[PDB]
Amino acid sequence: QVNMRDMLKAGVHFGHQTRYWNPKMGKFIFGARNKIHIINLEKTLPMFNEALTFVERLAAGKNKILFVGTKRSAGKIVREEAARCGMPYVDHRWLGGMLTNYKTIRQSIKRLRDLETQSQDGTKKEALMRSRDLEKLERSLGGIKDMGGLPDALFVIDVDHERIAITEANKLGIPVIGVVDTNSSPEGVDYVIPGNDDAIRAVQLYLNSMAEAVIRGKQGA
RNA sequence: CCUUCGGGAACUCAGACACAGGUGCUGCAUGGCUGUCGUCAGCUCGUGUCGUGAGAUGUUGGGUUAAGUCCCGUAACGAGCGCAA
């Protein structure tokens, strides 16, 4: 949870190169070294918990938390997270429309749904192009199968990259927990998490602590 | 020509009121299931987003194709309509 070692050993402290940096993220910076900014991990800790506390006090009252993270780096660690442990997620291309235009995205969760007979039957040419394009809908909307409407919290692990995601969340009102690296901007994210969002090591750190947040918050209730 | 043995009818033509006839005008208050695309997959829409707005995005880009069959990327996601069948 709050152990310097793992955080210090697994990414986190490292920020983006000084040239690419936001002046809004000045407070969460403990200076610089070797022409790179060092995120302050003495202020990450405190906030982390408020991010974990919130998340664990959301599943205790039974709620949904979207796990956004459609990035090469986080494109495998966001499959073995809290979404596999009982949450909704997105790992490939946050389609600009989900949550704000959820009604039109609601009616496109059926790719194989209305063909659960001949999809296991393996026609031939008329099925192969749908078989091929069954994964299409299985990749983009694949992790949003179960949702029952909108969520109540969003958890992005790279606010600068998944900036569209947060614009919709804020537009509707659903709180956003998010890792903000030095080059990103901490504006719009309800609960911030100032930390590295590029190294895999750090990527699992939040995911695994958020996986366990709902894991030690769903059994309680 | 049917017959309660009363009565009735159609027509070559035929007499009085009204008429049918537009057989001139005019596709500029009236065509519906075309008299001009080379066969362009090109023209649009619902919702969402961006803009004070008219708009725009979707439909742009990278590749590919007779060809929105496409594929990969992308504030868009779907759709109306195909050679296939």
Side-chain angles (χ1 to χ4, degrees), chain A residues 52-158:
Chain A
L52 287 176
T53 276
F54 191 86
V55 146
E56 147 219 337
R57 186 228 145 259
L58 244 248
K62 189 69 129 99
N63 281 153
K64 265 121 180 10
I65 305 227
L66 224 324
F67 272 43
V68 199
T70 72
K71 194 149 113 186
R72 231 56 123 115
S73 8
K76 253 127 227 192
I77 285 104
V78 83
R79 274 294 166 92
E80 276 97 328
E81 59 333 38
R84 146 274 287 194
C85 294
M87 291 298 186
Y89 75 101
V90 34
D91 178 37
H92 185 55
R93 230 298 237 56
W94 170 286
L95 307 174
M98 334 183 11
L99 342 154
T100 24
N101 172 48
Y102 183 59
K103 154 268 260 263
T104 274
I105 250 331
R106 148 127 34 195
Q107 79 219 23
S108 187
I109 309 267
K110 315 74 136 62
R111 315 75 12 141
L112 126 127
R113 157 204 157 103
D114 265 328
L115 181 251
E116 279 170 75
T117 37
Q118 166 62 243
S119 76
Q120 274 83 12
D121 178 294
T123 8
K124 177 76 350 100
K125 106 94 37 162
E126 307 66 10
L128 178 57
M129 209 243 139
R130 278 150 59 195
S131 207
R132 144 112 190 187
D133 276 89
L134 176 255
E135 285 76 82
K136 147 87 217 283
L137 262 181
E138 205 188 60
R139 210 169 44 144
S140 39
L141 274 175
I144 304 270
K145 253 175 304 73
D146 169 303
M147 30 28 170
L150 287 184
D152 291 84
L154 225 76
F155 179 88
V156 193
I157 89 147
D158 187 319

Side-chain angles (χ1 to χ4, degrees), chain A residues 16 71 156 158-164 166 179 183-185 197:
Chain A
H16 272 72
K71 194 149 113 186
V156 193
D158 187 319
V159 170
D160 154 84
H161 190 281
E162 314 287 348
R163 179 41 83 158
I164 288 246
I166 297 133
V179 148
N183 87 137
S184 173
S185 101
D197 69 13

Side-chain angles (χ1 to χ4, degrees), chain A residues 13-71:
Chain A
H13 69 303
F14 291 4
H16 272 72
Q17 184 190 171
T18 34
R19 140 143 85 288
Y20 311 92
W21 143 93
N22 239 81
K24 272 170 219 25
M25 284 267 304
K27 349 174 273 319
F28 313 155
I29 285 224
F30 179 63
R33 72 184 78 163
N34 210 218
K35 307 137 76 69
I36 224 97
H37 271 145
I38 269 55
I39 291 104
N40 209 192
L41 87 191
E42 305 253 322
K43 207 182 174 132
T44 312
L45 238 42
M47 290 161 142
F48 213 146
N49 308 326
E50 325 309 46
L52 287 176
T53 276
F54 191 86
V55 146
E56 147 219 337
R57 186 228 145 259
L58 244 248
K62 189 69 129 99
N63 281 153
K64 265 121 180 10
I65 305 227
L66 224 324
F67 272 43
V68 199
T70 72
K71 194 149 113 186

